[PDB]
């Protein structure tokens, strides 16, 4: 090439290949479920977060339709089918303070990256657990934040981070359930530390929104914490089953957010028949139905644990619907993964730097759409591919 630098991204894609870690998008057919056309073949997905199994759900598409039809097709950008959402997302996650205002984001990525810009800076300290979710870690570099990393859950630890820091402000940040191991962080522990050093509590709510809590409102519902030192950033495309995101907190914390993040975090809206639908979804997370979708993953998650100890590989104890399998190499990891797929399932395949070295696995991901019958299915796989490699 005469654009020399096209040579060397052919050449660094050929040792890619080599290596045989050249990764491939699926392209979907069908809407997101447990069954789905997938590159033109029908398989069972294990590779999404849709954990209460809305995003195909018929009351959703409805509400984007009429979403659509009330409020235009592009937001131009505040929609009232935004601030309506703001409310609805106050009422239904912010029961952790007296006073909560929401506000919504176009991504979970940038609710996290207004609210650490906001309310870190220079002279600010941030605690961050060490197995945060990358893009978390992101979003406190440009803060400009002094970072320190606490060992993962460990509150003795952080404790001793937190006294021999003398710094103004001090913001500790977790995931609430982390994502690659299915475990719950220490809400209360880590809570009581807030409280005790006058920090500010950041969790990223994720993976709990909709599937902890009662009514589905989250982690810090779940653990029935009331403090106006937590700021909570949740996802709508997840267990939602839409997309957007949102913080939710004390309303002066909320307002402080929107004088100080940077304009650009605000810009270009979500479509607002989105929102619309997120407020929907709200009402079938919050009724019979999503408690009766939650029961039902809760019994495949019980399944799933014991089907996952019954394989040869390293099971990560968990009692969420993530629930990893850890083969070690990427070799190893790949090839059970090909091995399923070769089955119609669809498990994605986790490498480093996603995970420590070493460590790569299977991340099963389950859904209230999924059925005894797939995860027998997932069973019989995992099984005669042991026996294969054995």
């Known amino acids: 090439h005469h654009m020399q ?16 870690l050249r990764r491939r998008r699926r392209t979907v057919d069908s809407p997101c479920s447990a069954h789905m056309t997938v590159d033109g073949r029908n398989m069972i997905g294990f590779a999404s977060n849709d954990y209460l199994g809305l995003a195909a759900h018929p009351l959703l598409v409805a509400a984007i339709t009429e979403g659509a039809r ?149 982690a810090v519902a779940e653990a029935a914490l009331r403090s106006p030192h937590l700021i909570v950033v949740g996802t709508l495309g997840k267990a939602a089953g839409v997309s957007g995101a949102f913080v939710v907190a004390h309303e002066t914390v909320i307002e402080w957010l929107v004088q100080r993040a940077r304009p650009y975090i605000f810009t270009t809206a979500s479509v607002p028949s989105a929102a ?15 408690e009766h979708r939650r029961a039902h993953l809760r019994s495949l998650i019980a399944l799933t644990r014991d089907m996952l100890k019954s394989t040869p590989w390293l099971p990560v104890d968990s009692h969420t619907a993530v629930q990893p399998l850890i083969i070690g190499s990427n070799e190893a990891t790949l090839d059970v993964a090909a091995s399923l797929d070769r089955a119609n399932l669809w498990v994605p395949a986790i490498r480093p730097p996603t995970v420590p070295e070493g460590t790569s696995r299977l991340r099963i991901s389950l859904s209230a759409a999924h059925s005894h019958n797939d995860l027998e299915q997932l069973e019989h796989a995992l099984m005669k591919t042991a026996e294969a490699r054995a």
């Open 276 to 290: 619309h639908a997120v407020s929907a979804s709200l009402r079938i997370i919050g009724g019979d139905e999503g």
């Open 70 to 218: 009330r409020y235009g097709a592009g937001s131009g950008g505040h929609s009232r089918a935004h601030a309506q959402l703001e409310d609805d997302l106050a009422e239904f996650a912010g029961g952790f303070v007296d006073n909560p205002r929401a506000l919504y984001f176009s991504t979970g990525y940038m609710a996290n990256l207004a609210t650490l810009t906001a309310l870190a800076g220079r002279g600010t300290t941030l605690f961050s657990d060490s197995l945060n979710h990358a893009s978390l870690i992101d979003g406190a570099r440009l803060s400009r934040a002094d970072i320190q990393i606490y060992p993962h859950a460990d509150a003795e630890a952080l404790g001793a981070m937190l006294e021999a820091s003398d710094a103004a402000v001090k913001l500790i940040v977790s995931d609430t359930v982390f994502s690659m191991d299915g475990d719950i962080a220490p809400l209360a522990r880590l809570l009581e530390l807030a409280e005790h050093h006058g920090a500010w509590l950041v969790v990223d709510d994720a993976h709990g929104f909709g599937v902890l809590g009662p009514q589905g409102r989250g």
């Open 5 to 20: 630098l096209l040579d060397t991204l052919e050449q660094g894609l050929k040792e890619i290949d080599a290596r045989g």
